[PDB]
Amino acid sequence: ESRIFSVDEYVRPSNGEPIRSVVLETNDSVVVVWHAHPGQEIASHVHPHGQDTWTVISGEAEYHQGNGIVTHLKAGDIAIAKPGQVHGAMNSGPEPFIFVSVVAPGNAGFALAEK
Amino acid sequence: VNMRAETESRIFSVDEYVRPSNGEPIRSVVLETNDSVVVVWHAHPGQEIASHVHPHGQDTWTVISGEAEYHQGNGIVTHLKAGDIAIAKPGQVHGAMNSGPEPFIFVSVVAPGNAGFALAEK
């Protein structure tokens, strides 16, 4: 029914590894809300056959691009991983790091990877 | 400051792609690939994103700033605010009007990247 989803309703804060909170999954995209507490890492991974587009809602973090590459993200940034590109994050900031991930296509596979 | 080859040029600041206009909102493209087209949209109060349908694509909006009336087709309107996600699946009419006061700014991800559209109110 609903076509609108509020991020604050969908964040799933975790003591352990951040929770992959799925808003809506379809054949065309997987839409997920991620939340990292200060000091929490979003484990690096790759979609061998899809794109992952992050839109940052709040906070500031380190974006892990693979091969030790670290770039800084803040609220209002878009971070894109094309097929095969490693992506992850470390919330090195004092506020929560919250973003929306749109993976396309909706069946893009997944592997863990190294920051 | 830092600059990388296009492959590893992967962070885009919404503010750098915002294109305010006093006429029809501007489709400011961040990146177009086979897998998605990523666009930054901006509407002033009272401005509209025309209602349309992608027969074979999903359009996922993430709202950065402001509030809007999200049109779902047929005069059906729901309320969008900053931090909300709006999703049109294939064959779902979607459009918006900035109901104010702030600029209404969102990131649209259309998938697949080549999904066509048609203007439609229902």
Bridge pairing between strands B48-53 and B37-43 = unpaired
Instruction: Write down the domain spans for chain B.
Output: 1-122
Residues of B with CB under 8 A from a CB of A: 2, 7-8, 10-15, 30-31, 33, 35-36, 38, 57-58, 60, 62, 64, 70, 72, 78-81, 83-90, 92, 94, 107, 109, 111-113
DSSP state of B25: P
Q: What method did the depositors use to determine the structure?
A: X-ray
Distance from CA of B109 to the nearest CA of A (A): 7
Residue B100: CB atoms within 10 A of its CB come to 14
Distance from CA of A111 to the nearest CA of B (A): 18
Q: Side-chain half-sphere of B85: how many Cα atoms within 13 Å?
A: 29
Angle at B117 between CA B112 and CA B118, to 5 degrees: 165
Instruction: From B94, B29, B31, B11, select the one nearest B59 (Cα to Cα).
Output: B94
Specify the CATH class of A1-115 in words: mainly beta
Residues of A with CB under 8 A from a CB of B: 3-8, 23-24, 26, 28-29, 31, 33, 50-51, 53, 55, 57-58, 63, 65, 69, 71-73, 76-83, 85, 100, 102, 104-106
Q: Nominal resolution in Å?
A: 1.8
Sheet holding B11-13, edge to edge: A21-25, A30-36, A97-104, A51-58, A77-81, B11-13
Q: Which residues of A touch B94 (CB under 8 A)?
A: 3
From the list A24, A82, A105, the residue facing B87 with the nearest CB is A24
Instruction: From B16, B85, B57, B95, select the one nearest A104 (Cα to Cα).
Output: B57
Sign of CA dihedral B108, B110, B113, B118: negative
Q: Which helix (H) or strand (E) holds B14?
A: helix B14-17
Contacts of residues A68-72 at CB distance under 8 Å and 24 or more positions apart, as own/partner, are: A68/A115, A69/B8, A70/A115, A71/B2, A71/B10, A71/B11, A72/B11
Task: Give the Cα separation of A104 and B32 in Å (integer).
Answer: 12
Residue B122: CB atoms within 10 A of its CB come to 11
Task: Give the Cα separation of B86 and B55 in Å (integer).
Answer: 17
From the list A31, A53, A76, the residue facing B38 with the nearest CB is A53
Distances in Å between the alpha carbon of A85 and those of A39, A45, A88, B40, B95?
23, 8, 10, 23, 33
Tokens representing residue B47 in the block: 């401005």
Indicate the CATH number for domain B1-122: 2.60.120.10
Distance from CA of A90 to the nearest CA of B (A): 15
